Design a binder for this molecule. Structure first.
Ligand SMILES: OC[C@H]1O[C@@H](O[C@H]2[C@H](O)[C@@H](O)[C@H](O[C@H]3[C@H](O)[C@@H](O)[C@@H](O)O[C@@H]3CO)O[C@@H]2CO)[C@H](O)[C@@H](O)[C@@H]1O
Length: 320
C-alpha cells in the first residue's frame, strides 16, 4: 500500500568525508526500539539514506560486509515494526566527488551498484521502493538522465516489481522541475513502474538552511506554489509523483501554516511526502522531528493529521 505520510530516517550517510568511517562515531543506523516509536505514531513509510562509498568502497566490487549488514538489520527491524522502507542512494549523482558518466565513474559502475542493491534486498518484505539517487545537481545535471537509465537497468535485472523513485536535476527541485524534467521523459522502465520524486524547502533559496525566519512578506502558499510546477508536469505527461524531502523549523507558526497547506494540496493529488527528517543522531538540528527532551515537534501533529486524511490507493496524480 502507498502511504501519503512518511519520514526520512537519516544518519547512515552522515560525516561523508570519513570513509569507511565507524558506525556509532561517524554514522548511525537505527538502534533497537527505534522504529517502534514511529510505528506507534502512525507513520509506516521511511526513506532511508545510504552512502554509496560505504556500501561499495570500490566501483564494480562486492558490497561492503559491515555496512550492508547494518542495512540488513535495519530492514529486519522495519519488517518487525510494519515499516515500509524506501532505500535512498544519497549521493548527488557522484562517487567520491566525481559525476556519474565521467571517465572516473562510468554509468556501468552505477548500474553495477543498483544491481547489487536489488540482488541483495529484493527478497526483503520491508523493502518498498528504490530512490535510485538523491539530489543530482550542478555539473551532474546534464549527465543525470543517462545515469538514471543505467540505474533503472541495474535494479530491473533483479527486481521487476517495485517502484523506482526517479529524482531530477537541480537538487530535484519541485519548483524548477519542468525546466529540466523533459529529459527524463526518455527514460524507459521495462516494468513501467517509475515514480518521479521532487524536493521542496520553503526558505527563500529553497536550500532548507532556514538561516533566517520567514520574513515580513512571507506567503503561506509558498509550499503549494513550489510543488505546483512539479504536479502540473506530472498531470501534463501522465506520470506519477512523490515528494522525497520537505522540512521546516519548529519555531514559527508561519512555517507550520505553509506545511499544512502543502499537505492539503499533496493529499488532493495523492502525492506522498517524506518529511526531512527524523533520525537517531540529529541533536539540536533545526529540522529534526526526532523526540528530544525539551524540544517541541509541532510538525509531527500535522503529519499525523494528514495521515488520518489519507484515502489514496496509489501514487497520484489521478489521470483524466
Ligand atoms: O534543496 C535542498 C538542497 O539545496 C541546496 O541549495 C541550493 C538550492 O536547492 C537552490 O534552490 C538554490 O538555487 C539558487 C541558485 O543558486 C541561484 O543561481 C539563483 O537562481 O537562486 C536560486 C534559488 O531560487 O541554490 C542552492 C545552492 O546554492 C543545498 O546546497 C543542498 O545541500 C540541499 O540539499
Amino acid at each position: 500500500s502507498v502511504d501519503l505520510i512518511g519520514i526520512n530516517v537519516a544518519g547512515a550517510e552522515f560525516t561523508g568525508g570519513k570513509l569507511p568511517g565507524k558506525h556509532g562515531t561517524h554514522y548511525f543506523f537505527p538502534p533497537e526500539g527505534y522504529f517502534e516509536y514511529w510505528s506507534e505514531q502512525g507513520i509506516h513509510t521511511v526513506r532511508f539514506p545510504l552512502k554509496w562509498e560505504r556500501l561499495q568502497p570500490s566501483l564494480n566490487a562486492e558490497l561492503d560486509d559491515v555496512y550492508a549488514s547494518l542495512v540488513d538489520d535495519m530492514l529486519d527491524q522495519a519488517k518487525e515494526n510494519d515499516i515500509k522502507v524506501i532505500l535512498d542512494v544519497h549521493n548527488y549523482a557522484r562517487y567520491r566527488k566525481k559525476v556519474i558518466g565521467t571517465e572516473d565513474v562510468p554509468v556501468s559502475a552505477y548500474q553495477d551498484l543498483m544491481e547489487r542493491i536489488a540482488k541483495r534486498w529484493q527478497g526483503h518484505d520491508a523493502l518498498f521502493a528504490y530512490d535510485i539517487m538523491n539530489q543530482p545537481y550542478g555539473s551532474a545535471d546534464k549527465l543525470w538522465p543517462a545515469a538514471a537509465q543505467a540505474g533503472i537497468d541495474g535494479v530491473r535485472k533483479y527486481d521487476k516489481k517495485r517502484p523506482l523513485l526517479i529524482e531530477g536535476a537541480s537538487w530535484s527541485s519541485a519548483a524548477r522541475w519542468p525546466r529540466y524534467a523533459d529529459e527524463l521523459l526518455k527514460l524507459k522502465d521495462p516494468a513501467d513502474n517509475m515514480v518521479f520524486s521532487a524536493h521542496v524547502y520553503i526558505d527563500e533559496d529553497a536550500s532548507g538552511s532556514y538561516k533566517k525566519g520567514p520574513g515580513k512578506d512571507f506567503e503561506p502558499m509558498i509550499g503549494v506554489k513550489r510543488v505546483e510546477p512539479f504536479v502540473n508536469w506530472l498531470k501534463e505527461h501522465g506520470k506519477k509523483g512523490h515528494i522525497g524531502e520537505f522540512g521546516i523549523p519548529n519555531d514559527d507558526e508561519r512555517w507550520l501554516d505553509a506545511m499544512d497547506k502543502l499537505l492539503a494540496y499533496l493529499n488532493e493529488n495523492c502525492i506522498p511526502i517524506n518529511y526531512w527528517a527524523a533520525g537517531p543522531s540529529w541533536g539540536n538540528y533545526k529540522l529534526s522531528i526526532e523526540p528530544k527532551d525539551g524540544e517541541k515537534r509541532p510538525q509531527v501533529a500535522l503529519l499525523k493529521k494528514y495521515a488520518a486524511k489519507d484515502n489514496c490507493s496509489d501514487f497520484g496524480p489521478a489521470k483524466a
